[PDB]
């Protein structure tokens, strides 16, 4: 009646799109990965795909993830993790947001910046509150750059 | 399995959650186990001290 997510088989299915260190190679690969992420509802699948984004360092690949709808998707995961009070996934999501080269136009798309600002003030987790505080200060500097 | 948390080093019984399938004891073990599998997957694609496992 169910099937536990196998994170090893998830990475194995993406063998051709990733390097030996788990980084997305091209902008064509990040489009197919985003299509899989949009259908990922189990926590194991989401946490595994977030590790792939965190390991990817090419800015042109990270910007493509934002353009195809990855910033809207992370907002939906952030909203669900905040409602269900999933601290470990909230931590990993905010680490991904800090890893992504977000611009001012990206931050104006949804209420992610608002939810992160609220976490920096009222979160009872010490590491999540500190990460949200550093994330807000970084976004304050991005707005101040123009 | 369903007898213990699938994360290596955790012997706790799994709990029921709509976010997995009765094989994790907590949210932290989900993130830690996925990180363990990711690192082992990277190690399996890098240089090895033996040809076959
Ligand atoms: Cl099963
Ligand atoms: Cl899924
Ligand atoms: Cl959701
Ligand atoms: Cl937890
Ligand atoms: Na959006
Ligand atoms: Zn089962
Ligand atoms: Zn556990």
Author numbering:
A (entry chain A): 2 to 147
B (entry chain B): 568 to 620
Sentences from the paper on this structure:
Ser/Thr protein phosphatase 1 (PP1) forms a large nuclear holoenzyme (with PNUTS, WDR82, and Tox4) whose emerging role is to regulate transcription. The PP1 nuclear targeting subunit (PNUTS, also known as PPP1R10/p99/FB19/CAT53), which is one of the most abundant regulatory proteins of PP1 in the nucleus, has emerged as an essential regulator of gene expression.
PNUTS adopts a nine α-helical bundle structure consistent with the PNUTSTND solution structures; its structure is most similar to the IWS1/Spn1 protein (DALI Z scores = 13.4–13.8).42 PNUTS helices 5–9 form the TFIIS N-terminal domain (TND), which is a conserved scaffold enriched in transcription factors that mediates binding with TND-interacting motifs (TIMs) and is the domain that exhibits the greatest overlap with IWS1. This domain has previously been shown to bind directly to the MYC TIM (34VQPYF38) in addition to TIMs from other transcription factors (including SPT6 and PAF1).34 Helices 1–4, which pack tightly against the TFIIS domain to form a single compact fold, adopt a distinct α-helical bundle that is not present in other known TFIIS TND-containing proteins. The Tox4CTD adopts a novel conformation, where aa 571–596 form a zinc binding loop in which Tox4 residues Cys572, Cys577, Cys592, and Cys596 coordinate a zinc ion, while residues 597–612 form a long α helix (the Tox4 PNUTS binding helix). Finally, subsequent isothermal titration calorimetry (ITC) experiments showed that Tox4CTD and PNUTSTND bind tightly, with a KD = 0.3 ± 0.1 nM.
